[PDB]
Symmetry: C3
Subunit: 48 residues, 3 copies
């Protein structure tokens, strides 16, 4: 599927961006990711 391939390219681009980040920057990013997913899980746990 087209959209599937586009998503993989978006993911690979983000991985290349992440590769340039320092160890501490990566930890800050991972923390942000965890917090965002948890906010998403809560707001979803409300309507679903």
């Amino acid at each position: 599927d087209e959209q599937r391939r586009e998503l993989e390219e978006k993911i690979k681009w983000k991985l290349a961006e992440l590769a340039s980040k320092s160890e501490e920057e990566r930890k800050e990013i991972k923390l942000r990711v965890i917090a965002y997913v948890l906010v998403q899980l809560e707001d979803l746990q409300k309507n679903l």
Copy 2:
């Protein structure tokens, strides 16, 4: 944007909550986050 600032406040609140969790609780939370994102990625990989 308003919604953007609101999201950052939601993320900061979640970060403050995470900061109070023990190391083992944090590992349990990260595991849950990983599993949830993968479920989301699959269900999305179906409609998209």
Copy 3:
């Protein structure tokens, strides 16, 4: 709620799948998860 219980079962199934993965496979999966969430955060940071 029904959908809530279904989500927990989906998450537990994914956790069981993750448990079978090697340490290196788990790192690859976590990297993919981080990149996907960041793509999601960007595309959301555009419409919201």
